[PDB]
Ligand binder design. Structure first.
Ligand code: NA
Lengths: 310, 310, 310, 310, 310
């Protein structure tokens, strides 16, 4: 029984983050726990305060026509507790619920793990005898609470795209709204735990350039190589399978290349020194001592530029 | 309370993908979030002047006879929210709910990870005093909304098989409808993370063909074998146990054969060269230097043709 | 209000498999999704169609006395949606529901992974003013559906055991029924992924019998040993801890023994060869080249017979 | 509306284990599926059979005052099926439900994996206006079904502590009952999968006592040590973090000590034998050949006695 | 419809811990099972005992107005079981429910695993026709049960912060209450499973200082480095990614540094000694023999002071 109107019905929306948590990169989901607040004109609910007795009268959801607001990018239907309903004299309805949902928003891993992300919560509503369009009351958005934390990330800002994408679907009109939680990853821990160990075992690997022991050099380069495969696996598992190339995915691959050519070099210099050609062998190795670090640093300049430098 | 039955009751169906997600290859399941739309006329509901109050009015599920539509290949009963019910002047009812389900559809892994799949959602309806058959209205199907993504996959098409399978079951006849979501896997990340590294360690394996140090050659070939075993494990765990052979299963197995014969050879050349036959030893190893890559490349040609080329 | 009869009430049962899936060997559980069909006579519900108006009438569960059937070997109570209730003129009630549950049935791992299993679904009912016995109607126990698949398994047959187990419980008598779905495992994928790799790494181990290189033979034997531990762990984790010995458990163990006496031999031939006794060492070694394959093939014949051969 | 009493109300309890399963050593939880039987006199319910149709009449839960009995050491409130309620003429009520709960009882891991455990189910009832005390009818306590099995454990006995702990809580008194399910771990599988391999690689380690090859002795001892760390990890993951010391925890730690002094010996004999001091070196090694197994066997007797022998 | 008020309604609170469990460090959550006790005056409930029959009357939650108390840092709405409601003649209501929830509270990992934590449970209530303030009755908060155990942790205390935080939210005010469960972790098992083995393989690593065998020293240092990579991984995974530096993270990283400088050194001493400079090389290792343990112990004093010494 929507409010009988001479005009299209605006439902005012606002979301107060109380808790957000469980950002799942493999799933590309996160879990949020918040207030949802709705506001609208139902003049059928208009009462005269003085004669009816009181400043606001309160119903239970069963009593009133309430718009069916739905989350678009949500997995299973939301859980909500209706915290309050209030009608002001002129028929102004104040709805307040507390919900929790895991919403599904895609992620961009190209600058992983130095990425920043923008999570979206989309509210849609579907019209009937009066049409519904939604819009945002920014004072009842108040952002998040000041204890709101998302483990492993920095919350940059929580705002809403002020007013909606209105479109046709299955013969009726729908109005969609976009609330946006921007986060930046805390990359710190990747450094002592992933990047630096990788670097170390790579450097250890080419330590085989001030050596002339084939019988040992093979041992070195393949040891370090194994450890790097372990790191590749460790990293790969806690990420989704992306159709594009990431920054540390790039680094990791580039490293496999350095290991392969290192192996090649090692092999060549040994073949040479058994072909009674120690001059040319030793000069290849001395080249490598300069080549490998320099071409590495260069490749990394190019690479970092290619990812972040645009 | 079935509808006055002058005819077999047609229920018009449609599914609108809002979200699909969590394709589980070990499970052969995926999760869908969609509009389900049902429509039929119940002439008992027919009132048809705009009289005495409204053009079309809305009842709630408990007031009306609703065909009980069920998904065949789902795990638990679906979780559904009824979005609206509208009854038309001759009692033409349009039912709209929003559900989420994890649907269970088999997958074909033979051309993994270059496989494509066609997921199924099967709807049955079951009869009584009149017979029910289902069918599809394509406006209320239109597939996905074009924001639908399934991580790690490209969504090709969402269609429905227009004609139902109407068949006998126990007491009464049932009507089944087949909606089909075709997807193709995004193989990109498999190359830098699995195939290329696999290849590299196989090649480093063959580097022992330009060496005569048994004591180190063994080190080489068993090391690389180890990393292959690790890769075999990594890949194999995250797939189900298929009764058939997959493409990268074929590849991985072939690679085992190459490692085993490599080892055999290494052993042979050291045994010969301690059995005082360095001519024949050096000729067998040098032979292998050409042999192994070529038998590898053509074996892969045979294999690729054997899989994709048919 | 149970049906007042003369003496003991037969409630006719039938189960139609719709989906079965998620066999968990560590849990020894699996998930089933099926029709449950019940039938019994309540002569109080008997109506004659001439005066009552219709050929058969249908109630809702609260309208009728319905026997409460329960599954014995189930984790949490199955949850079901009732498809229909029909009473025949003579008071014959035909009940039909659709349930899904994970039923808990034990497994025999002695011939893993070449095992076959017999899954059970047990139905219980509890009596009062009339005695209840359950029995099976085979015509609407039309078995299973032909799209029914259980991943990694072949479904051999689905039938039910015709006479119930009637016994005293909590001082009233209960009636129990046994439906049993026999499956046989699909071992195919175990061969290229576990067994053949196991064998290979074992043979590569025995390559140390054509080497006089301790310095390397040690490398060979502990390397392969390690890979065999990785395979052991891999196989072992996806199994429960059985109080008995499994077939591949036996194999894996025997393999450990082979690795140990191999190490021993290597140790011995090196000590002999430095103890200035190359004669007995080399003859011990040539012995081993013959012994190890032969005692392996023998032990495996013995074992294969010991398990499968009785 | 409790039965108005001239005395404290005894509610008679009994629990019938139908299924038990999912013992979690990390969580220290397990899952149970059982009958709960309650009984009390509500003299207000007293009816005499002479008046009405039947000797005992049956109600449904909403009609009657039913005591709220709760499991104390359970995670979330149990979910139950009320199977039957019968009031006998003297107003004697027999209540029967079938529940499933995962109950939380601590475990003692000191003799792992040769420990036995005592699982608990605690029932409380909280009085009001009259006193409620719980007590046990052993005739209605089953112990278990004759098919009740708990994977990886031997179920010894299910009994109950007959007199309750009745105590003050938040100003009213509660009555607690303690049911005790005794189990013994089935350790068989630990021997072929964990204990014996672990020992073997320890022995293989000690092969370096018959070697005099530093490069190979080192190869040996670090290889074996690697596998022992892998085993330590393997075991450690499936146990919780106890403030005390477990048995295989002790053994495993001891083994680490053996590997360390082993390495020390190896390094020492190499150093002596390069200090042109083969006398001292070879005599230390010959010593170790006897020393290591003996100090091991002793350490292990002292250990076992220290654990099980008290 | 709160009790008509002349002034702010105080709702008196209390929490009795029955079970707490599943402390998750990656999630930074834990699970609790407790009594929640609420008490307030609603004078509309005032009764004459004599005329009405009973000194205290008990309702069920629907009959009465009950204040909506909600938990702030919880994931989903708690699951609650309402155990009692008792009203006193003067309209004083005693509410008692048994709830279970996983509450989300942040953790400080800087002194891991020698950290202590203060877990929080925050209760809020929100106002309407009258305002609610919550407050704590310390007796109905009679601490914890002394069978309350938290695996892997020692429970220090359970208390409540006596004064509420009363603040404005969304145009009406809320009253927040802070209960604090202080725990300290049980570090015992970290010593035999992580710290000592790490130390052992680091020492085993430094045995390469009494060895001029490059060909083996590489073997030593990189094998131990490998196992230490495994320890880093093991430890790291069971912790969340903190933006800051932890204590054992600090240690593990320092250890990587020691490995790198070790490799550097063995590499240089070998390079020197094949570069025909045996005096100074041997003096570099003789130095290292003292240097590495002493700089290690010194760095550890500085680090431990840096963490715990504040
Ligand atoms: Na080596």
């Amino acid at each position: 029984p929507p409010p009988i109107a001479d005009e299209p019905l605006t439902v005012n929306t606002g979301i107060y983050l109380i808790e957000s948590y469980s950002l799942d990169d493999c799933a590309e989901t996160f879990k949020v726990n918040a207030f949802l607040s709705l506001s609208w004109k139902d003049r059928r609910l208009a009462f005269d305060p003085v004669r009816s007795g009181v400043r606001v009268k309160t119903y239970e959801p069963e009593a009133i026509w309430i718009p069916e607001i739905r989350f678009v990018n949500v997995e299973n239907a939301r859980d909500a507790d209706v915290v309050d309903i209030s009608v002001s004299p002129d028929g102004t309805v104040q709805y307040l619920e507390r919900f929790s949902a895991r919403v599904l928003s895609p992620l961009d891993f190209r600058r992983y793990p130095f990425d920043s992300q923008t999570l979206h919560i989309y509210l849609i509503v579907r019209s009937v005898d009066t049409r519904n369009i939604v819009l945002a009351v920014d004072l009842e958005k108040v952002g998040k609470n000041d204890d709101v934390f998302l483990t492993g990330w920095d919350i940059e800002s929580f705002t809403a795209v002020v007013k909606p994408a209105n479109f046709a679907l299955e013969d009726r009109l729908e109005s969609k709204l976009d609330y946006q939680l921007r986060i930046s990853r805390q990359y710190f821990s990747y450094i002592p735990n992933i990047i630096l160990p990788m670097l170390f075992i790579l450097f250890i690997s080419w330590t085989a350039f001030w050596s002339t022991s084939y019988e040992a050099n093979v041992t070195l380069v393949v040891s370090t190589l194994a450890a790097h495969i372990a790191f590749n696996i460790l990293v790969e598992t806690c990420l989704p399978k992306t159709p594009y190339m990431t920054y540390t995915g790039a680094i990791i691959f580039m490293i496999y290349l350095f290991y392969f050519v290192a192996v090649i070099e090692v092999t060549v210099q040994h073949y040479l020194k058994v072909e009674s050609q120690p001059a040319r062998a030793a000069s290849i190795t001395r080249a490598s001592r300069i080549a490998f670090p320099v071409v590495f640093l260069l490749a990394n300049i190019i690479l970092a530029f290619l990812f972040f430098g645009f």
